[PDB]
């Protein structure tokens, strides 16, 4: 076994104890950090502290025995120490998963999650997490020799690894796929009122002032659903309500659908078709002029199409598919069944009736919703914090869990034995998870840094009052 001085385990356990107490004290002392996310960061801080305190205390207990077997007493103390480490490891997984649940629901169902997750409900959930993890942790140490327990912990680590892989793929690799660009899609690029922007836009296409509906995307059968909209305009054609409606259809593709759109354009007059790929700057002006944006997509994994429109006040009429279903709410748009022209025609009729009242607040809801999905926003920055925290967990626990994989799969293999002999370094990396996490919380939370700065000033006064 690879030697590391017992004092390293004790000192790292002290540094972790000092750091994580400061984290728990800061969240409790500051009412600004009294949100479910920081409460789940608090349970994670307890779990981190308890792991390093138990590993530090265990090292003190082992060194004491090497200095002085003491029968069952040492085995009983070992089982209790290992149960606290197991319980806290399960609780740390549960806490990170709870921050993952917190972030997913604050990103998509912000108002809904906030009303549900009260200080009482989050207090119950954390208590239930720790109650189930202490029960499971004790049971896991009883059947530590059993494969089922070791396989369960390895599966739980592989779940966290799969969570890290999917979060890194979303937050960093797919960053520019679903991330809204607030520097470009800004209402500051628009001049005048929406009434005059719509008036000028409709006058440019030789049309009267009416409820303007806009389509942007490829002309294809089974993807962006231009066919659904073209069928819906034909359904609306017979209705008297269609005369108060205006349609701007942009995109290229299928000559069959291009020719269909151009045929309805010359047939109705309130229908305008641009069979050209327009510049994002002009699409932005269209989003800020039109009343509604119709996204009748059969498939749209990223709500970016709706997000871009919502930024500039355009109320989206999209399909309840992928990202559109997630981004659009009752307050921020109208959702319809994909591939249903009859339901879309009714949604355009609903939108026409909706426009008779003041849509000013509806657009403000769209703007506020689209704004919360920006990378510079508190919701996305928290998801990046979550990816860093899970990333740090996975990296710090990976050698231990590979050691655990090796323990049950290849304990006889010299290549596994050589890796398994550096177990003390893997425990040191577990100590580091409890030291790196408080450094991340401070780095990612400006408010927690401020509260930490108040404790270093109060500790200077504590030591001053201690001597005098």
């Amino acid at each position: 076994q690879l030697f590391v001085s017992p004092v390293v385990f004790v000192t790292l356990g002290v540094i972790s104890l000092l750091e994580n107490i400061l984290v728990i004290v800061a969240i409790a002392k500051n009412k600004n950090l009294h949100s479910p996310m920081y409460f789940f960061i608090c349970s994670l801080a307890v779990a981190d502290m308890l792991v390093s305190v138990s590993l530090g205390f265990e090292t003190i207990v082992i060194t004491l025995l090497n200095s002085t077997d003491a029968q069952s007493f040492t085995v009983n103390i070992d089982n209790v120490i290992d149960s606290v480490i197991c319980a806290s490891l399960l609780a740390s997984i549960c806490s990170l998963l709870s921050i993952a649940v917190d972030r997913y629901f604050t990103i998509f169902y912000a108002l809904q999650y906030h009303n549900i997750m009260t200080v009482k409900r989050v207090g119950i959930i954390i208590s239930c997490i720790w109650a189930a993890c202490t029960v499971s942790g004790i049971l896991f140490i009883i059947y530590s020799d059993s494969s089922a327990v070791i396989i369960c912990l390895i599966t739980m680590f592989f779940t966290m690894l799969a969570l890290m892989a999917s979060l890194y793929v979303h937050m960093f690799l797919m960053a520019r796929l679903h991330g809204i660009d607030c520097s470009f899609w800004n209402e500051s690029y628009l001049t005048g009122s929406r009434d005059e922007r719509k008036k000028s836009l409709l006058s440019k296409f030789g049309m009267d002032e009416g409820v303007t509906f806009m389509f942007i995307g490829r002309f294809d059968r089974g993807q962006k659903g231009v066919d659904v909209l073209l069928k819906a305009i034909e359904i609306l054609s017979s209705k008297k309500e269609f005369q108060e409606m205006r349609f701007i259809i942009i995109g290229k593709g299928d000559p069959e659908l291009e020719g269909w759109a151009r045929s309805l354009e010359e047939k109705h007059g309130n229908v305008k078709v641009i069979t050209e790929m327009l510049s994002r700057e002009f699409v932005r002006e269209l989003y800020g002029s039109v009343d509604f944006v119709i996204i009748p997509s059969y498939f749209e994994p990223f709500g970016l199409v709706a997000l871009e429109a919502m930024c500039l006040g355009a109320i989206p009429i999209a399909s309840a598919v992928g990202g559109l279903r997630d981004i659009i709410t009752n307050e921020t748009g109208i959702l319809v069944k994909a591939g249903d022209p009859g339901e879309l025609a009714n949604a355009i009729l609903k939108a026409l009736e909706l426009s008779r009242s003041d849509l000013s607040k509806f657009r403000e809801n769209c703007k506020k919703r689209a704004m919360s999905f920006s990378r510079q926003g508190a919701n996305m920055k928290g998801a990046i914090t979550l990816t860093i925290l899970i990333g740090v967990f996975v990296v710090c626990w990976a050698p231990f869990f590979l050691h655990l994989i090796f323990y049950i799969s290849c304990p006889q293999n010299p290549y596994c034995v050589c890796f398994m002999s550096h177990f003390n370094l893997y425990l040191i990396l577990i100590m580091c998870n409890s030291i790196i996490n408080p450094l991340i919380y401070a780095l990612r939370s400006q408010e927690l840094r401020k509260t930490f700065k108040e404790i270093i000033c109060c500790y200077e006064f504590l030591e001053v009052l201690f001597q005098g």
Binding site: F9, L55, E58, I62, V75, D82, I85, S144, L404, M420
Partner: peptide, 7 residues
């Protein structure tokens, strides 16, 4: 008894 478990 040793440091951690499954060493």
């Amino acid at each position: 008894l040793d440091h951690x478990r499954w060493k």
